[PDB]
Structure 1
Amino acid sequence: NKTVVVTTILESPYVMMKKNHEMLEGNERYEGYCVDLAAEIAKHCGFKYKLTIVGDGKYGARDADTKIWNGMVGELVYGKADIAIAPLTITLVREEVIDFSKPFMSLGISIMIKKGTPIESAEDLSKQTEIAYGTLDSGSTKEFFRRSKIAVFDKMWTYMRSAEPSVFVRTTAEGVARVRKSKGKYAYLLESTMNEYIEQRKPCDTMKVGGNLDSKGYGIATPKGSSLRNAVNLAVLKLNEQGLLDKLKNKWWYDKGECG
């Protein structure tokens, strides 16, 4: 019937530009876990689609004053895209305005350090001042810290919100670059999936420390009232049960390992 507009985000190893992308067109420009997942979901649900990178480069949050959503969430809410296929965290505030499939991947918030940084846990970060730490802007990790009542995480947020210079970053790449360049004086709070990927990539100078802070999932999101909602949900379950999601995780994490 109609070509489905898929909103997604450039985030390794979910969606990446191929090495030779400038000689390619349309969906062929991109590779990654979510590029493969989009192809599979489309096949099972019987639609044609166009991958479009989210304009503002954000996941999505609601401005507290204007109540306007940005990011991939806003693209669905305001009718700019038909579906989001991305590492988009299922959250309460989002589920109030968009629908999510059952989760296709598990994750938790985690800590990234430069190798040798004397930090082993969230408690460790909160007890010192020499090592700065932050999160991604406009995402679910930031919101976790803003909202937490757990003593350690409340203390961390109190520090983060007013720290100078700013500890928050615009992209994961910016957070990772900051860790790598700061000689051990910056630690980054990010999802375990992204942390684990980066740990197995050159220059192999980062690591995940401590347990995950929470347990949650990424889901495929559709605007409320979407005719795709049921089919997409069942397709996610079908792909998990046929072992394809596990295969894709091995393809884009384990097989892409550069650190041994």
Structure 2
Amino acid sequence: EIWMCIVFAYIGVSVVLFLVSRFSPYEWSTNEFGIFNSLWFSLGAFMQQGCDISPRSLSGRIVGGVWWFFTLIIISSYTANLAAFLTVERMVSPIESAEDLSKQTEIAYGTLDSGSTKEFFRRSKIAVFDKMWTYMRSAEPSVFVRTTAEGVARVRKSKGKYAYLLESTMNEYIEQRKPCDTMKVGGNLDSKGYDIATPKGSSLGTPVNLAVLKLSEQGVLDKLKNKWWYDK
């Protein structure tokens, strides 16, 4: 609307300037301000560029002065608003740590409908994670998601307005899969692990434990991780 009214004001100012400059037969001219020349002078004045001619009559100079003031205000407003836009975009910082996510509230975030994540959130004593669990508990609409597939689909559709919380392994797997739209960001909130499980009181426990430790020290475990998380 501002641009529309600027064009209308330009047309009106040019027409009025031409009229007040050439309508009087007693000034017949002493001024080279035709309709085309009036339009040219107005266009030059708006762009704050040097004009070849300037009005000499009282009405012409009044029109020129008010057009100059309008042009100054509009150009300064445009520069100031563009500076504000650029500064606001520059100040925008994504979220890395979970604390930054906790302080912020623009982007929604929630965990699965069930699982050990819920128990970790509830039983935690960290102030950040406590307020996190309160925020999920009291939130509308339900950030809670039935399954992991629905969670990743929702995160993909929400175009950054949603965040998901899940195992780092599955998160890395989803990151390394097409179409490469999601990223794991930050550090692991807690510590867990996957271990080989054997029946109580079995002869297979001690040497499987020795085997997995030897495998980790030999580094082949990291090779398997890289091989199917990044290589494939």
Aligned to 2:153: 177
Aligned to 2:125: 149
Q: Aligned pair 1:124/2:103, yes or no?
A: no
Partners of 2:213 and 2:131 lie apart in 1 by: 39
Where does structure 1 lack aligned partners over 5 or more consecutive residues? 1-115
Where does structure 2 lack aligned partners over 5 or more consecutive residues? 1-91
Aligned to 2:178: 202
CA contact (8 A) 1:117 1:184 kept: no
Q: Cα distance 1:224–1:165, how it changes in 2: closer, same or farther (>3 A)?
A: farther
Cα deviation for residue 183 of structure 1 reads 1.9
Residues 1-260 of structure 1 aligned to structure 2 (within 5 Å): 118-256=94-232
TM-score, normalization by structure 2: 0.53
Letter in 2 for 1:239: L
Partners of 1:153 and 1:168 lie apart in 2 by: 16
Deviations 1:180-218 (A, max 9, x none): 111212101122222222222211111122222233322
Q: Cα distance 1:234–1:168, how it changes in 2: closer, same or farther (>3 A)?
A: farther
| Structure ranking higher in helix proportion | 2
Deviations 1:129-183 (A, max 9, x none): 3322122344333222111111111001011123233323343322211211112
Letter in 2 for 1:174: E
Structure 1 counterpart SS, 2:187: coil
Letter in 2 for 1:142: K
Larger Rg: 1 or 2? 2
Deviations 1:5-45 (A, max 9, x none): xxxxxxxxxxxxxxxxxxxxxxxxxxxxxxxxxxxxxxxxx
| Structure ranking higher in strand proportion | 1
Q: Cα distance 1:232–1:163, how it changes in 2: closer, same or farther (>3 A)?
A: farther
TM-score, normalization by structure 1: 0.48
Pairwise CA RMSD of aligned residues? 2.5
